[PDB]
């Protein structure tokens, strides 16, 4: 509805992520693996699940690709601004958001088919006793798909990454005010102001996702301990699989987006520093 994330990881490469759709498809991705991993007889089914999820991605991409003309128009506008059409950028950005909301039910149909797939697997979940259900599927899944991600994030220190990004925005904010106060008679002063304004907003979205990753890492790590060397009653076993698939989905969404936004923040700072190399060269050649 209003939970879209714009991402420019490379030069002239814009894309979007409908936050709720990402979490939803990811939740059912985890439900699927958890159901097939529970018993060894069904592990091999992951081949089919991987194939189906590829069909879901290819189908969803076909819907996103309808809004490609509007997206490529906004890419062309942003390209010109990275050299006054700031008002034209806002109207082309609103235009992209509009056709995304237009294809709302085309995306919903894909999401719903994904819910059905994972739910069918979830519904066929044997338990030899039903009063003692093996938590094997929970660990085999956790260990392969989720555990590794917990450790990469634990090592990263995402708060220092955020602190280093504020310093970048503060340096640019000071250079921007020193140019305005001292020598405002410069070319590309508006493009610096635009890039810094865009990078300030990217930072806030990274700041949001890192907050989620931080507590979700603690939650997942605490929860998994309790659903791992036990034997739940089928009803309770299924409840945990859903609960875990939920925690995994919120974590993977915010983690995936934070990394994508991180690349766009530093891609925009690369183009920003290209202009700073011009500004130092100009000031140096003038100083001759």
């Amino acid at each position, epitope marked *: 509805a209003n939970s879209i994330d714009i991402l420019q990881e490379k030069e002239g490469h814009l894309d979007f992520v409908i936050i709720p759709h990402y979490t939803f498809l990811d939740y059912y991705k985890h439900l699927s693996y958890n159901s097939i991993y529970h018993k060894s007889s069904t592990y091999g089914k992951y081949i*089919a699940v991987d*194939a*189906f999820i590829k069909k879901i991605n290819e189908a969803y991409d076909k819907v996103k690709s309808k809004c490609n003309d509007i997206k490529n128009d906004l890419i062309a506008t942003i390209k010109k601004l990275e050299h006054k059409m700031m008002d034209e950028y806002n109207t082309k950005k609103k235009k992209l958001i509009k056709c995304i909301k237009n294809h709302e039910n085309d995306f919903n149909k894909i999401c719903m088919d994904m819910k059905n*797939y994972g*739910t069918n697997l979830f519904e066929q979940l044997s338990c030899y006793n039903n009063n003692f259900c093996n938590t094997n599927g929970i660990r085999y899944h956790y260990d392969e798909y989720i555990h590794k991600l917990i450790l990469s994030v634990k090592s990263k220190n995402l708060n220092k990454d955020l602190s280093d990004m504020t310093n970048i925005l503060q340096q640019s904010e000071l250079l921007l005010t020193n140019l305005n106060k001292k020598m405002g008679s410069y070319i590309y002063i508006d493009t610096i102001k635009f890039i810094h304004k865009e990078m300030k907003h990217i930072f806030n979205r990274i700041e949001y996702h890192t907050k989620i990753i931080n507590d979700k890492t603690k939650i997942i790590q605490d929860k998994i301990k309790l659903n791992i060397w036990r034997t739940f009653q089928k009803d309770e076993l299924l409840k945990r699989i859903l609960d875990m698939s939920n925690e995994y989905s919120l974590f993977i969404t915010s983690d995936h987006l934070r990394q994508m936004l991180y690349n766009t923040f530093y891609s925009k700072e690369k183009h920003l520093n290209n202009i700073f190399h011009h500004l130092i060269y100009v000031l140096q050649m003038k100083f001759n």
Partner: single-chain antibody, 223 residues
Framework: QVQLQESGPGLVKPSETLSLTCTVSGGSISTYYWSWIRQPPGKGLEWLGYIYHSGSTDYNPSLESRVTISVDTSRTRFSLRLRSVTAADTAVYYC?????????????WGRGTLVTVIQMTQSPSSLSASLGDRVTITCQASQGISNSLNWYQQKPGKAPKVLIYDASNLETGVPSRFSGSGSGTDFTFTITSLQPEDIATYYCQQYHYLPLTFGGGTKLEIK
């Protein structure tokens, strides 16, 4: 296990509305695809339409808008209403279920009740081979289908049952002697070695373009 059971009039006077209901037992309806497929005596299969997701519907234009599929989810039943019947509508009505449209195939089929009032060209309509022989059937679509092709085995008297989905992939229990192959327009089903448990009529199906169509079938018998 999930089970579908159709219950209807079995005899409808011409131009009246045919009303059969299906009762989903041992499972919920929820957002699955609940279709009604009919089979005229001695003829092939026709998908009439389905109800899916939050009560959305899609019907076969051949039905001429006189078809309506509805669901009282609370009842856990879905039902068919076919207005202005003709002796054309004399058929065995199967109530069936697919899970998606992304990778559509029929998971469960009811017992089928007799009610008496893209071009999938399946190549060997009949075939009589000895046991052990390799039998190989062909299905050709009127246009591009990608690998959106399924194959069913309809045992004598029984409802059709999925053997291959997405042109080549076998369903979990189906024996390896069955082989799906093909993409785009030309598809081929092949039993590498004929078994006594194989005397059935096999049908192909497409799901690429919305009016879901079946093939002519191959009535396989022993010589």
């Amino acid at each position: 296990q999930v089970q579908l059971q159709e219950s209807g009039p079995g005899l409808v006077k011409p131009s009246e509305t045919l009303s059969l209901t299906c009762t989903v037992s041992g499972g919920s309806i929820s957002t699955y695809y609940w279709s009604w497929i009919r089979q005229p005596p001695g003829k092939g299969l026709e998908w009439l339409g389905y109800i899916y997701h939050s009560g959305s519907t899609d019907y076969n234009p051949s039905l001429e808008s006189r078809v309506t599929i509805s669901v009282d989810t609370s009842r856990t039943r879905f039902s068919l209403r076919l207005r202005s019947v003709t002796a054309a509508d004399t058929a065995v009505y199967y109530c069936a279920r697919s899970t998606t449209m992304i990778q559509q195939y029929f998971d469960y089929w009811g017992r089928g009740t007799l009610v008496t009032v893209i071009q999938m060209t399946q190549s060997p309509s009949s075939l009589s081979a000895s046991l052990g022989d390799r039998v190989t059937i062909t299905c050709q679509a009127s246009q591009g289908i990608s690998n959106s092709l399924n194959w069913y085995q309809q045992k004598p008297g029984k409802a059709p049952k999925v053997l291959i989905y997405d042109a080549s992939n076998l369903e979990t229990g189906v024996p390896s002697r069955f082989s799906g192959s093909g993409s785009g327009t030309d598809f081929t089903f092949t039993i590498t070695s004929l078994q006594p448990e194989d005397i059935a009529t096999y049908y192909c199906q497409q799901y690429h373009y919305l009016p879901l169509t079946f093939g002519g079938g191959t009535k396989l018998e022993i010589k």
